[PDB]
């Protein structure tokens, strides 16, 4: 605290250790609400220096459901109106209905999450990634563990449904070397009978494709 109009930033306290009472509690790390304590016992400046927060979880962390990212039900000590009674109360976070679209499982999915999760989802690139880079005891949800499983399947199904495109392109490539000439349409049966990729399915499928050449023009 200094009184000049324009106090340009500087390395150290320009005018000695900052004077005032509230500067006395900031010089020791406490927050400026220590100025309103009537007793500042060695436990008090421990209690209010936030060494370890007096703040807990509504249900057991092992049995928690709604995704509370990094929150507790912190109690806020209020001082009442005209006659200053001091009372305290437990303030919760705001849980929104998280109705997201996790494109891993190509469908909306709902998990109720605190506002802070609805931000850290978007900071993580998607809803699913926020489920996936968090880990067990960190993402202490239960719904988050039911939707991580579907996320872990419906990912390892994409990877599986990918290698299809590498076992299919292998066939498609290696069979083209036997669809080389249109000499015999009795032979196009035999090459198809070779890879057991029947004609009646393929013929019209290519037909629908040349029609699709006409469906897309």
């Amino acid at each position: 605290f200094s009184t000049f109009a324009l106090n340009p930033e500087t390395s150290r306290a320009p005018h000695g250790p900052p004077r005032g009472l509230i500067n006395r509690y900031i010089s020791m790390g406490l927050p400026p609400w220590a100025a309103w304590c009537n007793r500042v016992n060695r436990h008090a400046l421990y209690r209010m220096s936030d060494v370890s927060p007096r703040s807990f979880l509504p249900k057991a962390p092992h049995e928690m459901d709604v995704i509370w990212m990094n929150e507790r039900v912190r109690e806020r000590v209020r001082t009442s109106r005209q006659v200053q009674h001091v009372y305290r109360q437990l303030k919760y976070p705001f849980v929104k209905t998280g109705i997201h679209y996790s494109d891993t499982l190509d469908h909306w999915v709902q998990v109720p999450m605190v506002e802070a999760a609805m931000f850290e989802i978007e900071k993580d690139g998607g809803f699913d990634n926020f489920i996936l880079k968090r880990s067990g005891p960190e993402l202490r949800s239960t719904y988050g563990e039911r939707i991580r499983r579907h996320l872990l399947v419906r990912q390892k199904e994409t990877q599986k449904n990918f290698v299809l495109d590498q076992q299919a392109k292998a066939l498609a490539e290696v069979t083209q070397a036997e669809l080389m000439k249109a000499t015999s349409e009795e032979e196009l049966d035999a090459v198809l009978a070779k890879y057991g990729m029947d004609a009646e399915e393929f013929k019209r499928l290519m037909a629908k494709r040349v029609m699709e050449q006409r469906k897309s023009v």
Binding site: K59, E63, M64, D65, V66, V95, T97, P112, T142
Partner: protein, 122 residues
């Protein structure tokens, strides 16, 4: 600690009141469902009108037969009520314990077989 249920605040809280609900505990009353009991039906209510099969049927380890002499903490409240109260069957005759010296379920001879109607025991 009433709210140990699946946290769903804006939706309907399934089961909420039903038999199978959450948020009612584990070792609770209201668990008539769980009427499934390993002990055979006939030994907790007699095979016939006279409450024949009624009793506490200790069983041999090897014997596949299942008896209702449990000692789990959830089952001793009824295993004493057999030894001190006894059963007053709705037919008028007092069952397993009817007089002075209360039985010793753990010194019973082992359950040898379920009762039959035609003979006594299969």
């Amino acid at each position: 600690v009433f709210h140990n249920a699946p946290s769903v605040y804006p939706f309907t809280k399934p089961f909420h009141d039903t038999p199978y609900d959450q948020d009612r505990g584990r070792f609770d009353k209201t668990k008539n469902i769980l009427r499934e009991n390993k002990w055979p039906a006939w030994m907790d209510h007699g095979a016939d009108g006279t409450g024949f099969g009624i009793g506490l049927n200790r069983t041999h380890p090897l014997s596949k037969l299942r008896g209702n002499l449990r000692r789990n903490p959830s089952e001793i409240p009824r295993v004493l009520n057999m030894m001190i109260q006894g059963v007053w069957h709705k037919s008028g005759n007092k069952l397993y314990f009817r007089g002075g010296k209360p039985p010793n379920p753990s010194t019973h001879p082992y359950l040898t077989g379920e009762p039959c109607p035609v003979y006594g025991w299969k």
